[PDB]
């Protein structure tokens, strides 16, 4: 029954239980294999098992297309270490080793249980006939497509080889299809289903972007008597969660321009808010020194342009403030995301200025025209503008903040529990909005 999967999990993968109860649900649908399934789970190790364990208990051959071999090799090495018959087709392994595997597949009852191919090969006239015989011999049990987003021009890593993977699914009617990606706008997910030719019902397992501890709010730079003071206060607010504890935690601040980043560090530092500046304009030596201090809470605060780069996400990041709007809503999610990794209460804040908005507006406009002369008009050109327009909408339009993030991304509405500005005090929101109506010009 389900008893099968439980035993195989601990017997082969040496895991007492599934990491996430979502994982459990996902894997079970793949094991049923009644349904094409889609998994937008993150870099957390959960997604792989969702096609790995089913592949074993399938009693047929489990192909897995993966775009770069870096990713493949990591797993195949660990898979082997768990006494599994797995085989990678990467241009990396020799023109002779390749002839040995092509052969194995062609004979019936082949040794290969799991073939990690690359998209490139999977499409080429070179690989097609061995493929054909696997299908006809009803040897193909699952066709997995990792980094699916690659199928959609909206996704950054568009890989047209992946478009042939769609006509391939229709040819392999008997074999089910499992697509996976870390993150996907519903826009992207809708392209996936279509260009990959999935069979409805597709069963979907998408981790929600909403997180309990994160208290999101928006302020407007037009409407602050002392903009630096509000920030000082907000940094003090988020830090020192326990009065008897004094200073507790650390936090981050973001800045489109290098220069403005430096400015803010000093403003805060003078004000008692002990804070350091950090950008790509600096030499690397500077950065690793600064990061150290922040990492050890020598300096409880840092200020980092659009270039901190998740070097580490630290446990007790109590706050993340954006002095300016980030370049994309996604951008805001990721950036804010670095906060509150430890699950204890944390604050995310955006400081919105129509001044900022129009600054970034012509930035992206001019560097898009810069690529249009370089390439031409393209699907993804409009997408860049849109990705940012969503963040402007997030601040300008009143609404529970976690839900606006969930909408852009494609989660259902989350349970805020009085955990954002619009949810906590619907009215103070109305107040400051109708404020920016007047302070529009």
């Amino acid at each position, epitope marked *: 029954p389900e008893r099968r999967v439980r035993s195989t999990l601990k017997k082969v993968f040496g895991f007492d239980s599934f990491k996430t109860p*979502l994982q459990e*649900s996902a894997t079970m649908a793949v094991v049923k294999g009644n349904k094409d399934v*889609f998994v937008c789970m993150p870099t957390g190790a959960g997604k792989s098992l969702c096609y790995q364990l089913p592949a074993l208990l399938a009693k047929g051959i489990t192909i897995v297309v993966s775009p770069l071999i870096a990713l493949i090799q990591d797993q195949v090495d660990h898979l082997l270490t768990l006494k599994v018959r797995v085989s990678s087709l990467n241009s990396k392994l020799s023109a002779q080793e390749r002839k040995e595997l092509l052969a194995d597949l062609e004979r019936e009852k082949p040794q290969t249980k799991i073939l990690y191919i690359t998209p490139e090969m999977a499409a080429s006239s070179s690989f097609q006939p061995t493929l054909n015989s696997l299908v006809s011999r009803h040897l193909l049990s699952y066709l997995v497509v990792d980094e699916a987003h690659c199928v959609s021009q909206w996704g950054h890593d568009f890989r047209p080889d992946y478009l042939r993977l769609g006509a391939l699914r229709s040819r392999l009617g008997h074999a089910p299809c499992v697509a996976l990606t870390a993150t996907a706008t*519903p826009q992207v*997910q*809708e392209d996936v*289903f279509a260009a990959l030719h*999935l069979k*409805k*019902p*597709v*069963a*979907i*397992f*998408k*981790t*929600p972007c909403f997180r309990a501890n994160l208290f999101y709010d928006v302020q407007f730079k037009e409407l602050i008597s002392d903009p630096y003071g509000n920030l000082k206060d907000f940094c003090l607010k988020a830090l020192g969660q326990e009065a008897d504890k004094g200073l507790s935690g650390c936090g981050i601040v973001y800045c489109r321009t290098r220069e403005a980043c430096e400015q803010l560090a000093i403003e805060l530092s003078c004000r008692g808010v002990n804070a350091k500046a950090y950008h790509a304009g600096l030499k690397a030596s500077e950065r690793t020194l600064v990061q150290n201090d922040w990492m050890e809470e020598k300096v409880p605060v840092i200020v980092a342009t659009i270039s901190f780069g998740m070097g580490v996400d630290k446990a007790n990041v109590r706050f993340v403030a954006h002095w300016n709007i980030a370049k994309s809503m996604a951008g805001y999610y990721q950036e804010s995301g670095r906060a509150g990794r430890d699950g204890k209460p944390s604050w995310c804040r955006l400081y919105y200025s129509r001044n900022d908005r129009d600054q970034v507006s012509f930035l992206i406009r001019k560097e898009v025209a810069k690529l249009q002369e370089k390439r031409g008009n393209k699907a993804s050109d409009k997408a860049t503008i849109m990705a940012f327009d969503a963040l402007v909408t997030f601040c300008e339009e009143l609404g529970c903040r976690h839900a606006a993030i969930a909408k852009y991304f*494609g*989660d*259902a*509405l*989350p*349970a805020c529990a009085k955990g954002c500005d619009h949810c906590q005090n619907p009215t103070a929101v109305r107040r400051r909005l109708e404020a920016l109506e007047r302070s529009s010009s």
Partner: nanobody, 124 residues
């Protein structure tokens, strides 16, 4: 799973008027295209009209002027106003829920097509 349930048909005279309701229950997120199909017994199943999620809409040539669909985007439910009715239009009316992305907070969801039962429309 999802429920598409129809309402608001009956009988009426030549040149008359009715309004038809299509109601999707459950944990929906979005529906690519919702379409009204009429089954005239003794005839070909006929495409009536349809509304994309984005508010774009399209009508059959025969019913162009006379019919009009709409979403109470909020109510999560769409309507077909059928005025200047003719004997022609006598049929069972159902909707196709194409591209029905359904999802929950647990993260567990499905992309599916859903069909409604239909409601009965008779015109002198």
């Amino acid at each position: 799973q999802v429920q598409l349930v129809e309402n608001g048909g009956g009988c009426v005279q030549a040149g008359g008027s009715l309004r038809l309701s299509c109601a999707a229950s459950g944990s929906i997120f979005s529906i690519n295209r919702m379409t009204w199909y009429r089954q005239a017994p003794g005839k070909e199943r006929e495409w009536v009209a349809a509304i994309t999620s984005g508010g774009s809409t399209n009508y059959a040539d025969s019913v162009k002027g006379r019919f009009t669909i709409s979403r109470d985007s909020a109510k999560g439910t769409v309507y077909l106003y059928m005025n200047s009715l003719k004997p022609e239009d006598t049929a069972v009316y159902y909707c196709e829920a194409y591209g029905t992305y359904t999802l929950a907070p647990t993260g567990e969801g499905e992309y599916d097509d859903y069909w409604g039962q239909g409601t009965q429309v008779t015109v002198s």
